[PDB]
Ligand binder design. Structure first.
Ligand SMILES: *[C@@H]1O[C@H](CO)[C@@H](O)[C@H](O)[C@H]1NC(C)=O
Ligand SMILES: *[C@@H]1O[C@H](CO)[C@@H](O)[C@H](O)[C@H]1NC(C)=O
Ligand SMILES: [Zn+2]
Lengths: 97, 591
């Protein structure tokens, strides 16, 4: 939907994350500001060399390719817990004689 | 272990390159299309930060090593990271160097040659084509190099010693080794290449083409005597003012005076496209179907809607330069000063051919944002350009009627000007390679620099100056590619790379006819091999970049004679009524 949610002055408001040392298990979150540890190094608390802080941002442009485009991804998930079901789907057609 | 953390800084530098360097290419995309006085200011503000942020990563580049890398994917990914440049010395002599290159550029841009006083405009090549009198053109000839040769002499070689000082800091022999030693290859036992072997590697490439050249150089001696009898030696050399160009690398203007048969010249495309209605918007659509029917992927949709193909007639200042713009990441754009002429049609597949090579390294990051080296970038742009003059495509498109049958001599005509444009240019350019490969070292002394470039011109090229001059001339420095920061060896390396690419052009589509009349279209099974060589890019060394193409990993110019196989057997019975050889004592000014 790049025709509506972008401008030529820079749509870098949508941020992202490239890498981290650990592996996040699904169904939790982290807004943790954690320092990169390469090896024999202490923590300083400020950015610099080998303190690669992972606050990143994309490069959204309206003309930015046709395959490198913003895809608004909505992953809709369905759960059952052996319970009486509440969410019903679209029902059958109703006719009467 | 910091092997993956050294990997982490690579795509961390690209994410600050997809928004910093990509707009600086987009700002330069904006300027040569739209020239305003404020468009240059954010051009200069972005292009300086383009270098300075690349200098910002050069400060942290020397903190890591180079021999602690085992896997070959980061072996070439990291050598471009540690390329410092000339930043180790202070501002005592580097800041003075750009003040030399600007005053050498103002004399070449605002140069006037008069006592009929004209700029370095295309008109400079216009008196060289049409006018044939010498006395009205003698003052324009000697006064051309009287205002350039004396001028740029005491400023040129102070530009070379600065890079020869910094070459051994980059483990190079000279500034020529920055031009010639860029073909590094490391890896296994058969992968290791050292730098100083290309000098012998280029000698025997022309040893098999010199019997073709003197067969073609004695071809032109028969008929130019009918136009200038009292100037040219009979069985020897040639004066310097009848070359079709001031340096003799453009032998295209002289072609009405060296045509094989005067009964039928070459076929142009400017007469019949005015009848069917195919203007400048039409054949570019068939140029895209020529690019996607050979297995290569389709063009982007933004290439159709957001591109500027045709000259904007809204009072727009356009540079009118055919150039391919590599923006990257699907921002595939083009500008070309488009008309319907044949020279525009041969380059119609050139800069448009680069985008299909830009999608070869579209997967490749910013540090390796070129071809497999500096040589294969311009070769694949020209691998479809020399095949664009194939006559079987010109008959099938519908310009000539079907009853026009192409004779055996019809191929001989345009392959001659093809031979005079590149193959005739190699004896001028190959001596220019050993020009800078020996003046940069220092075996030739200070005050004999004039005659040795002429001594290479009497023996190899056979071109003698007709007026006597003094030692303080810089006629090899009269090219703006040679004088300023441009590589000229990429012009000759473009030939010998695509000369072997025309060999793999034959077995890819299962071709069996004459190799100069090649058309890769009407075949989709050719493309399954074409996606093998372009998918590797610069991530693999250049010793692997030749193996997947032909199968041999050596330089071979035997497919050049396979490219002109009807021209060699025809040429034997033409100029045998002459003596072959060279006389290095003839001079026109022996008064
Ligand atoms: C150049 O200016 C014209 C008219 O203002 C505009 O349509 C065009 O997009 C401009 N070029 C670029 C590359 O923005
Ligand atoms: C390729 O196909 C087109 C359309 O069928 C035809 O006009 C053209 O002659 C063919 N080319 C060759 C080399 O057969
Ligand atoms: Zn080229």
């Amino acid at each position: 939907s790049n025709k509506l949610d972008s401008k030529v002055s820079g749509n870098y408001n949508y941020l992202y994350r490239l890498f981290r040392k650990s592996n996040l298990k699904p169904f939790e979150r982290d807004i943790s500001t954690e320092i990169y540890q390469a090896g024999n190094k202490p923590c300083n608390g400020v950015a610099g060399f080998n303190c690669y802080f992972p606050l990143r941002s994309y490069s959204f442009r309206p003309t930015y390719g046709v395959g490198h485009q913003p895809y608004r991804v909505v992953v809709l998930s369905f759960e059952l817990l052996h319970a009486p079901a509440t969410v019903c789907g679209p029902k059958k057609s109703t006719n009467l004689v | 272990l910091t092997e993956e953390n050294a990997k982490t800084f690579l795509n961390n530098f690209n994410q600050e390159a997809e928004d910093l360097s990509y707009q600086s290419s987009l700002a330069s995309w904006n300027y040569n299309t739209n020239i305003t006085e404020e468009n240059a200011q954010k051009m200069s503000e972005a292009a300086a930060k383009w270098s300075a942020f690349y200098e910002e990563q050069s400060k942290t580049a020397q903190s890591f090593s180079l021999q602690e890398i085992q896997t070959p994917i980061i072996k070439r990914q990291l050598q471009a990271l540690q390329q410092s440049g000339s930043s180790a010395l202070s501002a005592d002599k580097n800041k003075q160097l750009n003040t030399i290159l600007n005053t050498m550029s103002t004399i070449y841009s605002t140069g006037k040659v008069c006592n009929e006083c004209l700029l370095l405009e295309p008109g400079l090549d216009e008196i060289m084509a049409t006018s044939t009198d010498y006395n009205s053109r003698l003052w324009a000839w000697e006064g051309w190099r009287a205002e350039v040769g004396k001028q740029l002499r005491p400023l040129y070689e102070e530009y070379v010693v600065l890079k020869n000082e910094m070459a051994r800091a980059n483990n190079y022999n000279d500034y020529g080794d920055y031009w010639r030693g860029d073909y590094e290859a490391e890896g296994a036992d058969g992968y290791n290449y050292n730098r100083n072997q290309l000098i012998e590697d280029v000698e025997r490439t022309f040893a098999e083409i010199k019997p073709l050249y003197e067969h073609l150089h004695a071809y032109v001696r028969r008929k130019l005597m009918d136009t200038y009898p009292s100037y040219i030696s009979p069985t020897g050399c040639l004066p310097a003012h009848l070359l079709g160009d001031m340096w003799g690398r453009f032998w295209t203007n002289l072609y009405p005076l060296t045509v094989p048969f005067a009964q039928k010249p070459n076929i142009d495309v400017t007469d019949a496209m005015m009848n069917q209605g195919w203007d400048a918007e039409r054949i570019f659509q068939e140029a895209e179907k020529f690019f996607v029917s050979v297995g290569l992927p389709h063009m982007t949709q933004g290439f159709w809607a957001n591109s500027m193909l045709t000259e904007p007639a809204d009072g727009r200042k356009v540079v009118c330069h055919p150039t391919a713009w590599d923006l990257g990441h699907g921002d595939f754009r083009i500008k070309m000063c488009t008309k319907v002429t044949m020279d525009n049609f041969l380059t119609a597949h050139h800069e448009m051919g680069h985008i299909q090579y830009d999608m070869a390294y579209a997967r490749q990051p910013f540090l390796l944002r070129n071809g497999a080296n500096e040589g294969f970038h311009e070769a694949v742009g020209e691998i479809m350009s020399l095949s664009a003059a194939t006559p079987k495509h010109l008959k099938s498109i519908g310009l000539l009627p079907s009853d026009f049958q192409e004779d055996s001599e019809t191929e001989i005509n345009f392959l001659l000007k093809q031979a005079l444009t590149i193959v005739g240019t190699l004896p001028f350019t190959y001596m220019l390679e050993k020009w800078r490969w020996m003046v940069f070292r220092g075996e030739i002394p200070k005050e004999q620099w004039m005659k040795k470039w002429w001594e290479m011109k009497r023996e190899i090229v056979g071109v003698v100056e007709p007026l006597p001059h003094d030692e303080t001339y810089c006629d090899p420095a009269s090219l703006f590619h040679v004088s300023n920061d441009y590589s000229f060896i990429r012009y000759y390396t473009r030939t010998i790379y695509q000369f072997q690419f025309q060999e793999a052009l034959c077995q890819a589509a299962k071709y069996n006819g004459s190799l100069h009349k090649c058309d890769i279209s009407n075949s989709t099974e050719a493309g399954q091999k074409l996606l093998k060589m372009l998918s590797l890019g610069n991530s693999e060394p250049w010793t692997k970049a030749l193996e997947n193409v032909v199968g041999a990993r050596n330089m071979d110019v035997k497919p050049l004679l396979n490219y002109f196989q009807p021209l060699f057997d025809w040429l034997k019975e033409q100029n045998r009524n002459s003596f072959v050889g060279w006389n290095t004592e003839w001079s026109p000014y022996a008064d």
